[PDB]
Amino acid sequence: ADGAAAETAAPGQSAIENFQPVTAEDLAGGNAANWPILRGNYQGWGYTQLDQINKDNVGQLQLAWARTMEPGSNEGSAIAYNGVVFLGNANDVVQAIDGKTGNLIWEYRRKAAKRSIALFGDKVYFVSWDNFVVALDAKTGKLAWETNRGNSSGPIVVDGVVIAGSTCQCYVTGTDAESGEELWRNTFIPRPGEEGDDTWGGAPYENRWMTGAWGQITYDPELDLVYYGSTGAGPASEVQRGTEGGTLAGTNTRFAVKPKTGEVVWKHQTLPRDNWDSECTFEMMVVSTTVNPDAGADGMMSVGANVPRGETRKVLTGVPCKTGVAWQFDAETGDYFWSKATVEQNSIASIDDKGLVTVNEDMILKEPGKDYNYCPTFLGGRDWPSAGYLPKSNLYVIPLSNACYDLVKLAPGKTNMGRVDAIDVATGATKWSFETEAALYDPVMTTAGDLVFVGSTDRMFRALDAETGKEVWSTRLPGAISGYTTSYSIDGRQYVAVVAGGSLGTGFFKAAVPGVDAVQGGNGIYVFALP
Residues that bind Ca ion (CB under 5 A): 122, 213, 371, 373, 406
Report the SS3 class of residue 509. helix
Cβ-based burial of 263 (10 A; exposed 0-12, middle 13-18, buried ≥19)? exposed
Distance from C-alpha of 408 to C-alpha of 410, rounded to nearest angstrom = 7
User: Do 283 and 218 contact (CB within 8 A), yes or no?
Assistant: yes
Between 122 and 146, name the residue whose CB sits nearer to Ca ion: 122
What SS3 state is found at 340?
Answer: strand
Contact 444, 388 (CB under 8 A): yes
Which ranges of 420-521 does DSSP label H, i.e. alpha helix?
504-512
Least distance CB 269 / Ca ion (angstroms): 19
Nearer to Ca ion, 162 or 287 (CB): 162
Minimum CB–partner distance for residue 138 and Ca ion (Å)? 9
State in angstroms the smallest separation of the CB of 129 from Ca ion.
17
Nearer to Ca ion, 153 or 427 (CB): 153
How far apart (Å, rounded) are the C-alpha atoms in residues 156 and 161? 8
The length of the chain, given as a count of residues = 531
The smaller minimum CB distance to Ca ion, of residues 181 and 406, is found at 406
Phi and psi angles of residue 172, each rounded to the nearest 5 degrees, phi first: -125, 140
Q: CB-wise, 25 or 406, nearer to Ca ion?
A: 406
Nearer to Ca ion, 410 or 490 (CB): 410
Closest contact distance (angstroms) between CB of 406 and Ca ion is 4
State the minimum distance, in angstroms, from the CB of residue 106 to Ca ion: 16
Question: What's the CA gap between 357 and 246, in Å, rounded?
Answer: 13
462 vs 510 by CB, closer to Ca ion: 510
Least distance (Å) from Ca ion to the CB of residue 364?
15
CA 145, 256, 364, 380 dihedral sign is: negative
Structure letter (DSSP) for residue 369? T
Least CB distance from residue 177 to Ca ion, whole Å? Answer: 8
Count of other CB atoms within 10 angstroms of residue 374: 20
Beta-carbon count within 10 A of 406 CB: 10
In 106-139, which positions are buried (b, 16+ CB within 10 angstroms) versus exposed (e)?
bbbeeeebbbbbbbbebbbbbbbeeebbbbbbbb
Can you point out the beta strands (E) in 270-425?
285-290, 300-303, 312-318, 326-330, 336-340, 348-351, 357-359, 373-374, 388-390, 395-401, 403-406, 409-410, 418-424
Q: Which is nearer to Ca ion, 213 or 454 (CB)?
A: 213
Pick 171 or 432: Cβ nearer Ca ion: 171
Q: Is the CB of 122 or the CB of 159 nearer to Ca ion?
A: 122
d(CA 451, CA 471): 10
Tell me the sheet residues that pair with 396: 389, 423
DSSP 214-255: ----EEETTTTEEEEE---EESS-HHHHT-TT---TTTTEEE
Question: Whole-number minimum distance, CB 378 to Ca ion, in Å?
Answer: 7
Nearer to Ca ion by Cβ, of 86 and 434: the residue is 86
Residue closer to Ca ion, measured from CB, 240 or 373: 373
Are 499 and 461 within 8 A, CB to CB?
no
Task: With CA atoms as reference, report the closest residue to 450 among 437, 433, 467, 436.
Answer: 467
Strands (E) in 56-206, as ranges, are 62-68, 78-81, 84-88, 93-98, 104-109, 118-120, 123-127, 132-137, 143-148, 156-158, 161-164, 171-176, 182-187
- Shortest reach from residue 277's CB to Ca ion, in Å: 7
We find the least distance from the C-beta atom of residue 175 to Ca ion, in angstroms, to be 13
Minimum separation from the CB atom of position 110 to Ca ion (A): 20
The nearest distance, CB 184 to Ca ion, in angstroms, is 21
